[PDB]
Every structure is written in structure tokens, then in C-alpha cells.
Design an enzyme around this catalytic site. Structure first.
Site, PDB file in Angstrom:
ATOM      1  N   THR A  12       0.911  -1.251   0.096  1.00  0.00           N
ATOM      2  CA  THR A  12      -0.006  -0.057   0.024  1.00  0.00           C
ATOM      3  C   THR A  12       0.840   1.191  -0.083  1.00  0.00           C
ATOM      4  OG1 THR A  12       0.185  -0.229   2.492  1.00  0.00           O
ATOM      5  CG2 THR A  12      -1.893  -0.909   1.262  1.00  0.00           C
ATOM      6  N   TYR A  16     -17.104  -6.134   1.375  1.00  0.00           N
ATOM      7  CA  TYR A  16     -16.773  -5.738   0.297  1.00  0.00           C
ATOM      8  C   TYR A  16     -15.287  -6.134  -0.148  1.00  0.00           C
ATOM      9  CZ  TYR A  16     -16.001  -2.219  -3.795  1.00  0.00           C
ATOM     10  OH  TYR A  16     -15.820  -1.585  -5.020  1.00  0.00           O
ATOM     11  N   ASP A  83      11.164   4.325  -7.004  1.00  0.00           N
ATOM     12  CA  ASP A  83      12.529   4.011  -7.844  1.00  0.00           C
ATOM     13  C   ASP A  83      12.525   3.890  -9.050  1.00  0.00           C
ATOM     14  OD1 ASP A  83      13.108   4.036  -5.003  1.00  0.00           O
ATOM     15  OD2 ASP A  83      14.378   2.130  -4.853  1.00  0.00           O
ATOM     16  N   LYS A 155      12.930  10.431 -11.934  1.00  0.00           N
ATOM     17  CA  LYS A 155      12.671  10.597 -10.430  1.00  0.00           C
ATOM     18  C   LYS A 155      14.107  11.192 -10.383  1.00  0.00           C
ATOM     19  CE  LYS A 155      12.816   8.519  -5.917  1.00  0.00           C
ATOM     20  NZ  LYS A 155      12.798   7.183  -5.184  1.00  0.00           N
ATOM     21  N   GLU A 276      30.853  14.947 -30.898  1.00  0.00           N
ATOM     22  CA  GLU A 276      32.338  14.604 -30.988  1.00  0.00           C
ATOM     23  C   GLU A 276      32.553  13.322 -31.482  1.00  0.00           C
ATOM     24  OE1 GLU A 276      35.365  15.398 -28.151  1.00  0.00           O
ATOM     25  OE2 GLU A 276      33.524  16.625 -27.140  1.00  0.00           O
TER      26      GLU A 276
END
Lengths: 319, 320, 319, 320
Positions: A12, A16, A83, A155, A276
Site C-alpha cells: 500500500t 466488500y 525508484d 525521479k 564529437e
């Protein structure tokens, strides 16, 4: 109400039965989303984003195309760790064959942390998924009230809640307390306009990433190639430049058939063709406006259908 | 006027009586304004592109800047350097120059031959920063695009833009607009005179490898560096310095075998903190904190000239 | 434990008696701070930051100097609204005569909002106040895990939790889950090194801010001067340039004795001396590396002790 | 080759057969490379610094760009403009040019006479962007420091840097490096052909004032603009468009009297949202959302050429 499926890739992110318990948790953390859409949830994987593998990618993308084919499944939200979130979204962006919104959302802070970003990021991701304007925008990332195109996002900071940026362009939209606004859209090919198809593919080609620095070495090129790399992303100095020694090593491996794509350690900008290093003469490809880790996802996909220097370079100048 | 020595590490960053080095001579003609502000001496320390930089050029350079700065006649030292690795050279000298006299590194994003070449103006502003009073004791600085950046903080962040240089974690320490120098901040991190590193008797820097992490990572690159004899390894990990599981075990093996493993991040800014996801203490790694992989590599080669002790090396990363 | 006093300027930003109830609330929202320091609290004012006035400023600064004189009061934290937070901190920075830390902290999101930034900003502000390294750093702002010098900070975005930046320099330190690290420090004079003293001052001079645009007018200069402005900050085009018509109006008002300081609408950079407008000849002052709203706080303070063009310009080239 | 017309609004941004305008002629000599890529026509629309820009110059310019772009021989239109107000001119033309052919505004942060003058290169790159295929239907764009910025998003954000231009809310839409143009995004907001604004029969733009908010604010500036006959007022408020109490009542009074009050923010980026602290509906204001005070002023003068209705004007701010 729009039906939407949240595919959880680990734990998380917010505080139901939708289906997966991880998703029931989130729904309790943010009872708010339930007035917004009919939520169903699945557990695609149970890992941290730094453990992700190409197998999980295929699994996800294939599952995403399935869900999106269903007329009553309006969008898909993938709760993902931060990450490697940019690699997964980029993959999906070139691999999902639908015009429906695919929103990746995550959290820089634990949900158990005071001032956890996860709940508002989830609330906002859900409003974006069901937003009429997110259709045809390609795969997007929703973090810190912002909407980033999956091609452009990275990130850029280790801990900040605002760690996501689109260094070369900028976010494409904003979502403030669920109000969504798009100002731009990507112009480079994605989703239904992508030539790649991964149904039938079960394993992706090995592609290693090398990091450039003065007094560089040739043993890492060597070990990647002896370990069977099909491609090698060289994160070069400045405009994708290599240390003379590793350049020799990279020229030998390209003749041995390994595809060598020149990128940069720098962080932003395009690693241009005809700067280059002479790629035609040496047999390298220039990754252009893409970082090492996203250029790698592209190279893996390019490798599933070709290995010609000219054709691969065209892909880098295309996507 | 003040006497300034210009050490050329390659070619002319501007343009296409002899100061002492021909390159320096072409710079002086490239922009004469510089002569009205200082008496210049020129010197060719090496003639290479910055991508060809090596540890031995670094050692020779520093040793020379220290001889120059001991001289009373020498007020400052300007180093024309290629941009690609300017940040590593600047960071090295910053932990290695024993003088408070300004040491300024300048370069150009565009060829001197280019239209709208940035090198001329950067050179001119660079002479002004070297001869300004406030530059003393600021440490080694980079001057590019009207800005003054601290060596510890500077990084080339864009491949082509004339404003490629930045200090992502902090910001520039000052500005120089048409010679007018202003400082608004200064590094509170130890440098130059306050640095415990002394390169005087050192002939060689230890080998330190940098590895780039990604999902589906491997252990073959760790082992190769090991075989190739790396004394230390910088791991540009994912997010907050996180390794892919397989590659972590390989790294754990290298640390047991005496190779110093320092966790950094491929992300671009922020700190690779301790007490995060990886247990460094238990695994035997060192967190490089607020440093990118490439500068973390320069600090580690230095640390290694003194110690291989994990605790000490961590303390060095927590100090500089 | 270090004793610290939190001075509340309005409501709660985060979620026995410290003193002010507003402060008791925060202490309940973040019971965490109580293991860090002995907290006492006062209610300096009960307003929103967009209602702030010079009277509240004097009140605050005077009260801050009092508290800081006490040997057992280690630092002072001011919970402030974000709109005008940069003006208050800047004022205090040139007006507090102590080496002890003065930390201003606030919140971009209501504390009742999901993912409210306030609790972690407070936790972090408290760790900075009691940090041995924050001594002698001048007045600082703690927002979004960052530490900004009060001279350099501005609120650059309307809604982002990361709305605080130091456009010209950058933050000076970071505080992540209470761990504080400083990398730089200001080099421009503050606190004990400031020549201004506001004990004895009860009202600050009127200084209006004008906004430049093509097809500009001369009636706003006129109305400010007829309303008794002692100074006028002109937020000019580009490098502090004015529209020819308003320039005439600004030249007449400077001869009428109103001090005209040239700033910029641009957002960052220095509004330099000897660029396009001749300040000596016209009688204006160049605000240099400061925005309109902070250049105004300086001009008000400069005006409490002088009105000579040369002396005021020296102050702008000094602070 | 493609025929491009260059409209000069002031002087030479580069340097110190007749294209048609002398300034244009000096530009062509300033950098000949441009002649190998297009057949250039030059034209002096006005000769002023951008700080002297006025609504009437804006009207004449647009009317002319529209005559030029209707011509089949004309492929694009490049406008050399001073930087100070380039963003307002660009934004005006963007809601006012009825053609999908590229309209490119270029300038220089440094004088053409300056060392390392940026104008030459920006001009050259600007010709490339105007003649590139992908530039069609992108709307009006600004080309500065190797970057392509959308007119709706561009703003000069630094007083002196060659990289002064930015698009704080989004980012550049593309890049141009030594002529090589690439686009990575495009505005999804209506512009040019899709704009409902038609300046053809308009002789004058209504008066719209901008006020800068701060603590201890006043009501005398609101009243003066009112007396001076302002048809609309942009209030660069605090944070999320917040006024000081005293000045809010003054603003409420102006809205009752028929002056359109549009709340913006002095902050620099972000949106001045609705449903924030001020009740616009009840007070009769309009929130300018993702627009800075100066571009919000250009949109409002336009809106006012059609309507004074608060709801409609809000809708216009929520659309463009």
C-alpha cells in the site's frame, strides 16, 4: 460511475472487496475514491520497485491490454514504487495498445509517515484516470499534484515529495484536489502509434548500462559482452562522450554484434548525433533526448525486432 | 595590477609578448580586455579533451597549483578545462589545494570558432572572479554563464546548453555580470586549507569503479571491477541508493573482500541517506549522502589514500 | 531539553499548556516535538498572512528580541501563513539582534487536508531550531524538508507543497525526518550585523509597489505620491526598465523627495546599476538582487534612518 | 528555398541586395548562413525598445502578420523583438494570428556588440524553426537559447541571463541545436486559427491595469486606475491570488462599477484557482488560473473587446 481497476505491484502507498486486499486497504485509507469510480483491484506483483524485472513488465503490460479491451473498464491505475516507476511507465507507453488512460501513481513517503503524500497522490491519480481529457495522452505519472508524460518523466531526487520531474519538457498537466488541467501533450509516438507488440514475447534482451568517468576502464564493456548483453547503454561524459579506452572497448563490442547506444550521465538534454563521436564509422547509435535508464527500455524493445544500426537509430530518432 | 597564472589543460575556449603558453597567448588575443585587469602568465599543464582526463593529470595539476599559490606574486589561478569532467577536476582540487587564494575553473559550452561562442565572456568574467577580494577563502569555484558555483556543488547537468552547469542541491554562490562579481552565499563544508587530504607524496590514486543500477540488474559488473582490482566501488543505485537484490549480494561480497562499497544514486540530486532502506552498517557499505556518483568517486579515491575503514570513510562522507 | 517558544500568528498549520491554545493544538497534532524540546507558546496575532501589517511586524520582532535575550530560551519558531511568509522573515532577519535560531514554518495545505504538509514541516522546523548548526545562520524558513535563508526565499508557486524556492541561490540546508544538514550559509549581513533597530519605531514608512507593462501609465505613481508614499518599488520590465511615460512620472516623484527604487517583475536575477536606466541622473536606486516585495521591506527600514539616494543605494548593495 | 519575411520591431539583435529593411540587411550580413536556407524579405514595423511597446504597435504588427501569412509565397514570419516584453507580444499574436504557418519571435539577452552575443545564434536557429515542417500549427513560438517555447507559456524570468526565458508551468516544447529542430510536446490550449479573437476592425485595446499586492496594501491604486478609466484590472495577489482586506473592498467596488477584476498572483507560477479563498462569484471577480499577471492582462484586453460579462470572461480564462 466509471469502472477502474487498480493493479498493485507491491504494498500500500496510501494509508466488500475491490479484489486485491492491498487495494481494499487503500480504499479504506481513501474512502473518497469510491464516490468517484467503481474500483476493482488486482495484485500484479508483490515487490518493491527496485526488484522489478522484465518478466513483471510483460506480465503487467499484457494484463493492462486485457483490461483495457473490456468496454466497461475505463482506465487502469498502477500503484508502483517510485525508484523504477519511470522505466515501467515508459515500457507500458510503447507497449499498451489502447487510447484509455493508464495512470501510474506512488508515494515518496510511507503511508504510515506523518504527512504521507500517498493519499492525495491516489485521490488525484483516480481523478486523472476518469478524466475525459486524459484519453489519448499516453501513459502518465501522477505525483505531487502534477501530470507527467511517461516519455519525459524521471525521479530526479532521492527523498523529496516532489522528486518527479520532466527535465527536458515539464509536466503536461496539473491536478489540484482532483481538478485536472492539461496544458500540453506529447508529440512523440506512443501506445496505439507504437510499432512494438509484446504479446508473444516472454523474455526481453539483456542490455547493460555503463557509467562514464575520467580514467575509465574497458573491463565492464568486456564483462557485459561476455555475460551475453545484446545492447549496452553507455552513460557518457557530457554529450555522450567516452574515455578513449572504453571507446575502443565499445567499438570492438559493436563489431561483435552488441548494439552500443550512446547516452549521458549528465541528466538532461539530447545526446546528439554528429557531435564529437562518429557513430556511423564506429557503429554506435545516439540515444538523443533520453536518459540511460529509459534509453535501455527502448533498446530492449528495439532488440526484439531488429539489430541494424540504421534501424535502431531511426527508432531513437522516432520515439 | 594583480598577477594571475592561467593553466591550460587542453585548447582555446575562446577564439580560434608571450604569456608562457601559446594557448594562453591566443586567449589573450581572443579577448584583450583581460590584459587591462591583470598581468597574465600562461602555462600548458596537459593538452587533452576533458573526457581523457586521468588521475595522473589531476595529481600534476594540483601539485602545480600549490607551487603557484605559495608564491607571493601569484594572486589567483585560472584553469581552462573542458566541460565534460570540469566538475571532477574542480572537486579534486577543492579537497587538495592548500591556499585560500582563489582557484577558478572556466570553460565553454560552444567551440571558440562557434557563432555566439560562450568561452570569451566566461574567460573575461573568470579573470574578474579570480582578482576579486571576496573570492578568497571561498574554495575552488567554477565560472560559467555569468555564475559562480562552489566546487562541491557543481555538476554539468545538460549535454549542450550554455547554461549546462548547476548546483542541484544548493545553487550558485554568486554571480559575475560583465566583470561585476557578487557573492550571496558560501559553502559551509570544509575545503582547501581545512581539508585533511594531502597529495604531495602520492604518485597514484586508487581504482574506484562506478556502477549504474536498474531493474533486472546483474552481478557480473561488480565481479569484473573486483577482478580488475577496484579498491572501491560507487553504486549509483535506484531512488535513495537502492540496489537490485542480485547486485546487492554481489556488493556484499566485495565489501567482505575488502573493497569499499559506497552507495550513491543515479537520480541526480538529493542525498543517499543512512538509515534508509539498506542497512549499511550490517552490510558493510558507506552512504555518500549529498554527492552525485562522480564526485563521490573523487572523495573515495582520496579517502582510500588514507583509510579502508568503513566507519572512517563514512565520517568523511558525512563531513566533506 | 532545550526550551523553545512557538509564536503563533494565526491558526493551526499542523493537525498542560504550552501557553497559547493554538500551540497546544499543534502539540497534540505532533506529540513528537515534546520529546525534542520544552515547548511554550504565545499568540502574537490572530490573522491570515495576507492581512499582515507593519504593526504586527514590529510587535513580532520586538517580542522575538525579548524572548531571545532570555538565557533559557534557545530558539523561537513562528508558525506563519505562506502568502507573506518571505516578507516577515526578511524583516525579522534585519531586525532580530541575536545569534539564536529564528525559524518560520507554515503549510501549503490545510491541516485538515489529506496529506497536510504542516505536521512534518512543524516536526522539521523544531529539529532545525534546536540544531547546533542553525546558530548564526540568520532567520530561516523550513518548508518541504528544506532550509532557506530569509534573504533568498520567495513563494514561487500558488499551490504546490514545494512552493518555496530561493531563485537566486538555493536552499542552504535540508532536514529529512528531523535530520538537519547545512551546505551553505548567507554572506550578506543579517541580525547582529544589521544596522537597523526597531525598538523605539512604532510605525513604518509607506512604500508602494508598482507593476510595469507596455503601454504603462503615470497615474499610479501620482496616486501613491499623493497618498503619501515615502518610497516606491517599481517592478520593472526585464532589467528593471520602465515604460517611458511612467519613467517621467518616477523622475518627478523622486524630485518631490519620494525614494524610487527600481526592481523587476521578472522573478529572479539582479536589477543592476548602470544597465539601461541612469539612476544617478534620474535619482533612482537599483534594488539589485532582490524581488519587489522584499526590496520594499528594505526600503521601509532604510527610510526609518535616511533618505539620501547614495546612502540608500549603499544599503541595497549591502544587505 | 522557402521565403521568410523578417519583421524588425526595433534594432539589430546580432552584429553592430536589400531585404527590404536596413536592420534586416545588417542581420543578413551579421550571419550569412541564414541566406543559404531561405530567401529573406525584411520589414521595419516599428523602431523601439520593447519597454516602449504599446497596444497600437501590437495591433499593426498582427494585422501585418496576417497579410503576410495569407500570401502563398510566405512560408513563415520571424519577429526580432526586445526581450522585456517579448512574452506579451508573442501571447497577443498567439490569440490573434489566423494561419497555421509558423510565427517565430526571437531576440538577444546581450547586445549584438557584446562579447559572446547570443543574438546571432538565436537568429540562425530561429530561421530553422520557421522553415521546419513540424513548426506548422504549433502556434506562435519564442526561440531563445537553443529552446522553443510556446507563446502561452513563455515568460522572461531573469533580468540578465542568456537563459532568461522559461515556461514555468510546463516547459519548452522543443529544442533547436545548431539548426536541428526537434519538438517533444505541443500546447493543447487553443491558439491562432482556433482562437475566437479577431483584431481586424479594432483600432484600440481597452485599458487594463495591473496592481501588485503586499501586506499593508492600499485602496488608492485601485481608485486611481478606476478614475483613469480602466476597463479591467489584474490583481497580482498574494499566494493563491489573495488580496489584503482593505484592497479587496476597493476591488469589490470597482467590480460593482463595471470594471472587470481578474485575480492573478505575483508569485510567479501555478494557477490562481477558483474555489480557493476568495469567493469570486459573490464578489464578482474572475480567476485567471494558469497565467501570470502580464499575460492575463493581454487575455483580458482581448476578452473586453467582446464582453464585460463576468461568467464569459471566466470561461475565456478557463479555455485559453
Amino acid at each position: 460511475k466509471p469502472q477502474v481497476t487498480i493493479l498493485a505491484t507491491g504494498g500500500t502507498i496510501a494509508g466488500y472487496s475491490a479484489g486485491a486486499v492491498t487495494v481494499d486497504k487503500l480504499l479504506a485509507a481513501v474512502p473518497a475514491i469510491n464516490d468517484l469510480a467503481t474500483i476493482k483491484g488486482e495484485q500484479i506483483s508483490s515487490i518493491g520497485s527496485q526488484e522489478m524485472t522484465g518478466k513483471v513488465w510483460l506480465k503487467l503490460a499484457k494484463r493492462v491490454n486485457e483490461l483495457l479491451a473490456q468496454k466497461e473498464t475505463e482506465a487502469v491505475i498502477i500503484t508502483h514504487g517510485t525508484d523504477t516507476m519511470e522505466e515501467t511507465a515508459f515500457f507500458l507507453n510503447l507497449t499498451v495498445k489502447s487510447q484509455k488512460p493508464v495512470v501510474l501513481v506512488g508515494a515518496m513517503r510511507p503511508g504510515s509517515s506523518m504527512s504521507a503524500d500517498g493519499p492525495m497522490n491516489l485521490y488525484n491519480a483516480v481523478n486523472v484516470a476518469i478524466n475525459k481529457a486524459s484519453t489519448n495522452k499516453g501513459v502518465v505519472i501522477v505525483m505531487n499534484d502534477e501530470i507527467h508524460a511517461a516519455r519525459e518523466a524521471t525521479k530526479l531526487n532521492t527523498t523529496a515529495v516532489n522528486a518527479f520531474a520532466s527535465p527536458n519538457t515539464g509536466k503536461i498537466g496539473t491536478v489540484y484536489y482532483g481538478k485536472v488541467e492539461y496544458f500540453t501533450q506529447s508529440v512523440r509516438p506512443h501506445t496505439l502509434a507504437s510499432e512494438f507488440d509484446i504479446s508473444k514475447i516472454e523474455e526481453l534482451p539483456r542490455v547493460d548500462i555503463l557509467y562514464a568517468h575520467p580514467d575509465d576502464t574497458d573491463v565492464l564493456v568486456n564483462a557485459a559482452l561476455q555475460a551475453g548483453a545484446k545492447g549496452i547503454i553507455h552513460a557518457g561524459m557530457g554529450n555522450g562522450n567516452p574515455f578513449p579506452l572504453t571507446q575502443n572497448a565499445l567499438e570492438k563490442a559493436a563489431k561483435s554484434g552488441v548494439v552500443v547506444a550512446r547516452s549521458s550521465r549528465v541528466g538532461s538534454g539530447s545526446t546528439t548525433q554528429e557531435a564529437e563521436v562518429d557513430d556511423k564509422k564506429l557503429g554506435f547509435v545516439a540515444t538523443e533526448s533520453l536518459n540511460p535508464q529509459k534509453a535501455r527500455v527502448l533498446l530492449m524493445l528495439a532488440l526484439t525486432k531488429t539489430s541494424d544500426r540504421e534501424a535502431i537509430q531511426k527508432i531513437f530518432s522516432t520515439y
